[PDB]
Amino acid sequence: GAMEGILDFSNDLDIALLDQVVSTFYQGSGVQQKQAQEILTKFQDNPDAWQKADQILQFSTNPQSKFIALSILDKLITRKWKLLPNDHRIGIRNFVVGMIISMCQDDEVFKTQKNLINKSDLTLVQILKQEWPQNWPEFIPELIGSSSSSVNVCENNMIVLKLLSEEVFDFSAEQMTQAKALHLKNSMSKEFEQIFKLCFQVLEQGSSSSLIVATLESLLRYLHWIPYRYIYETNILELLSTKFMTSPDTRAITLKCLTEVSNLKIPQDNDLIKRQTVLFFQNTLQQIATSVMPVTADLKATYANANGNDQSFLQDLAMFLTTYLARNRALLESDESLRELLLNAHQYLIQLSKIEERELFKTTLDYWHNLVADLFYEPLKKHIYEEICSQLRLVIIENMVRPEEVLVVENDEGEIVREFVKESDTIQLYKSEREVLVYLTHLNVIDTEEIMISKLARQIDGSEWSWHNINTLSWAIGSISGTMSEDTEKRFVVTVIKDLLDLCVQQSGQDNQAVVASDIMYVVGQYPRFLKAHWNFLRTVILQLFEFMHETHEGVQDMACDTFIKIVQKCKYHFVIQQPRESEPFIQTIIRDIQKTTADLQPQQVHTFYKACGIIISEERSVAERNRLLSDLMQLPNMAWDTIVEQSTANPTLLDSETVKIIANIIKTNVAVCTSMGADFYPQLGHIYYNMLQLYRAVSSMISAQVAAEGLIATKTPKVRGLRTIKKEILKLVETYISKARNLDDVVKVLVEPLLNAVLEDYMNNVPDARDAEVLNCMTTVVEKVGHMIPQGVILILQSVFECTLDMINKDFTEYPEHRVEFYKLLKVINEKSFAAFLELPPAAFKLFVDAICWAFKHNNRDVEVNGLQIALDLVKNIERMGNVPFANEFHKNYFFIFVSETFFVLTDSDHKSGFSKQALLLMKLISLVYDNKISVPLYQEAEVPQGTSNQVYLSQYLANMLSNAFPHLTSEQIASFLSALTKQCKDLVVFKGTLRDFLVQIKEVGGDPTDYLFA
Amino acid sequence: VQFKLVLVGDGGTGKTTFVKRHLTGEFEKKYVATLGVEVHPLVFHTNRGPIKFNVWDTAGQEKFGGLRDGYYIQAQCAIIMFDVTSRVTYKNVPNWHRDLVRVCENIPIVLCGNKVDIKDRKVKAKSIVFHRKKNLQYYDISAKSNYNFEKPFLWLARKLIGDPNLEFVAMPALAPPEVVALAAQYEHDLEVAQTTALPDEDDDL
Amino acid sequence: EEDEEVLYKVRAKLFRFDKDAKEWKERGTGDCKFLKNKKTNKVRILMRRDKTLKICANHIIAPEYTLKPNVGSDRSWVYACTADIAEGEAEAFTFAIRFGSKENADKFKEEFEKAQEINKK
Ligand SMILES: *C1=CC(=O)O[C@@H](/C=C/C(=C\[C@H](C)C/C=C/C(C)=C/[C@@H](C)C(=O)[C@@H](C)[C@H](O)[C@@H](C)C/C(C)=C/C(=O)O)CC)[C@H]1C
Ligand SMILES: Nc1nc2c(ncn2[C@@H]2O[C@H](COP(=O)(O)OP(=O)(O)NP(=O)(O)O)[C@@H](O)[C@H]2O)c(=O)[nH]1
Ligand SMILES: [Cl-]
């Protein structure tokens, strides 16, 4: 198109045309905009593009054009500056400076072209980073001088300095070498005296200017690093905390500066400084009260209204108060004359803590946590804050977020329904609230009780009744469990329950009932200690829960299940024993009636139920009695099972979806019970084990048959998915059991051979899409637990899954994601526990193993990458451990350099940044192996190098060459310097890593200083 | 009533997927890296009328960065994205913010922690504090589950319209038409459709 | 939707078939409603996304339409729609709609078929 003209550099740049392209991109739309965008990117990325910058700046009438011009320069300056002839550097400096001056002197431009001026300033700052002060020593004194000549220039200088400080102190770590960083910090520091003087003057001879704001913006940055004397030994605190608080255009920035001040590095034994720290706070609070809002002000209301910058201001105030107090409140606590101030500050916080804004609430809550945690320990402090804490109890009790256990929620139509999904983002909020409230309760249990007991009584008499109110209250009451003495707790809980049951009676209809049920269940679940001392009560609670298991209300029903197991998890012993005035242990009662109780439950709920019963059964330590209970519990699934095993062994025609589901649910139930019973599950496992493995085979045959007859698409079908669920659940059951098994001999002698026989060949001999990753997962646990006892087995596992799995996952990084992850976990544990298995591999297979490892490195998926790196490290150790033997020798000869280069590659490609640490570790280990002469054979082949040549010398040479070719823009000395530093530092990871990081900086530019690698 | 929204954040954080979800309703499983920027209009219906975002969905991968900060020019609002399963992406948040606010000095910005649907969360709730001093709104989101997916836009809408009580409302639903050669090909097309498996058959819906 | 009687409501996930690609693509999750116009007695499907309330389905339950199974699912229907105005201008789609359970899927089909009969009248 017409627009592509600008891409043809063999002809002059048509600026007018450029401007059109740019306008089209920014102001245009659809296809046109899109084309223009691509055109512009191409232009920008053109390595000569920069040469046009001056022409653009001069002749363009579009600020975006110039901005782009500046991005081009910025790229050139940051990446290639020292590649440029000297003349070109000067020229660039001059026209960047000139432009800035010129834009500052024209008021209209200065007022209306801020974006472009800001960009220009940053561009300049990039030049400074390269050139200053070594090749620009006068920059600052002249900047300083220039500032008096013009208000615009002066203001603009402030922007420049703010950017410089940012680039030097705040954002340098990732972007500069250690040496260069230091150099520029040092340089800034050596001249800050003068910088500050200007800053102070401007601040003195002004009130509410854009110049004042700019100055204050720069101060915010300086505060990150300047020595404290500049803050404390000048009049600056007075200015900030009085003058600059009074006008709103300066207020926001001032407050942020004062916040940073409240974190300055500051001596602790200096009374006068303490006084100053007190004074600025006192001033600041005085300004708020008189210029903004009194302490009584309704901050919730104000925030909710969202005028102007109110939300921001309130946020910054919270940040200011919390930061200051957290650090300094002790300064205010002893001196009676400071009491009012301390309390008023807190009262502001209390008011802010009523605001409806989750994130802001969390900020304040974190402060409260800090405070109460301190009051809980520190002698004679709590009484100061008694009234503050009392108001806090209210705020928290009334803003309790829904606990994760409370599964009912109000929909948009005012109906109490089951939640669609977990409220995942309120989990931490609840913990934080509970923590603070727990502390608050400990601080004054009488207050807390009185508050709760009377709020509650106001629900009963109806005066204050509402869903929100009973809820927040109930949740609060549940959340403080543990804070009272058993005895105190006892009466409290009695009163609460009585009242909730009262509400249960008075408040009817399904929605009301759902709410009250949820609340009671939450409360009861939260007080196991109580339950344990009140058997009758406990028993009645459980029975009531069972009733709920027949609720048509799904939310309540589901909650009953979770509450049941929640209670059982803590109280199980009381179900296992025979209670006074009971005819049988309660578990017996539960089991006898399990069909009735669980009839209306969803399958997974039924499994949860069975799981709970398992917890109870495992309390029984007498083996005969326990096994008997297990037997009884499993009676229904075992009978279903026994009849299924009949029908299928007569004829492999299971083809029934109903049957498939039944089987799946049988296994799932076994899994559920195994999960809670662990090692104790063994007898039940044995009842089904052999038939279960046969069934696994039968089902495997069906899946294959189905794929053959219908195609791969078969695997999507409900039928096939169902058959696989059987296989997966089988695998899960065995995995679960083996992970918890206590008798490893039976695992090996009884479980392992048939398992392997049943699953391995099937996995190996299925088409890729039919292979269950769960097999891999199972095998990991097997190797983990008994790998040391089954060398031949481990070999078998590898033979059957290694190559076929590798071939699934080695075409790209994305296909078969579960296989991929499980695959490397398996290799990991094999490499750890059964290294011998890899020693037995044929050389070809071992090479693929090495490949497999490196491939893992190159993943961005962290699950894979991390394991890759670990396996590599373990492998190196495994090899080292073997000593000077042929296998070790061969390994190094074939693979040492493969690992070194692969590790380097991922370190340096900018795409594996998450792995930096472990990469570094691995690299350091590899280098240390040579540096320590732990490699007994020459790593080179003969005639390649003189015969005597040490592995150290060779390693250097290899590396220099690899780097020279890989990064040809680096100088030899840069490479040599880097390698010397790095090899010397192969015993000190933190230093070694810094050297790596410096290198990653230098490879992104040209002309990096080789001496940088001497940093120490 | 249209506002420029720039969307920034590390490669692979879910920026484009998030947008697409809002655009078409779909969930894109494949990671195809954005090249420079993609501009998409996006409308929401509110009690205060319709609001239009021109979403400038920028490239997070340095090597596909294109004009970089040039995209930010005259942005009226923004969303900074990270991935709660990837700590580096949170670490880079202040870099994205820096570059952004240098061009866009006074705009409302939402910080979004994506992919919370993933079990193994790495950037703990508790750690997420960068937004506080910077006056950014924060939300845990998931483009996959739609967890809080509407929140960033609702918030931004409220700030730009300047009405805290702004809510999304149902668009009126025009009566649809009574319609009735292609019959032959529709058979073919339907076949292909029926026998292509629906994704995520193991989801709740 | 003031002039309309709600004959049936169910939570669903709606897909559209991208022919060019060969994949199903989610169009929306929310309440799928069968609505009878009180004045005309016509029955339409109207479906809106959760939270945004955006229309992802708006079409008559044409007598001509047939609910077909999907190979992957025991709880979905697929069908050709020749005139959906969710996106604005009438447009043809091959839709799939999935439910929380088979029961729900089977209930939808029955309801769909009844609606079709009403539309015939
Ligand atoms: C309203 C309607 C509904 O359908 O269900 C209700 C839910 C109730 C739940 C649990 C309650 C608390 C179970 C009831 C236990 C009960 C009455 C136990 C007595 C044996 C008992 O111990 C009584 C007499 C005393 O007074 C109790 C209440 C306090 C104690 C233990 C005093 C003491 O020991 O000193 C749902 C889980 C509701 C939704
Ligand atoms: N599990 C999960 N995956 C997600 C979510 N959002 C996006 N993804 C996945 O993450 C990958 C990257 O998504 P994408 O939208 O390309 O991210 P991006 O920020 O646009 N990448 P770029 O900056 O390179 O253009 C995709 O495979 C996508 O399916 C989410 O909420 N949950
Ligand atoms: Cl500009």
Ligand SMILES: [Cl-]
């Ligand atoms: Cl001084």
Ligand SMILES: [Cl-]
């Ligand atoms: Cl116990």
Ligand SMILES: [Cl-]
């Ligand atoms: Cl050199």
Ligand SMILES: [Mg+2]
């Ligand atoms: Mg993208």
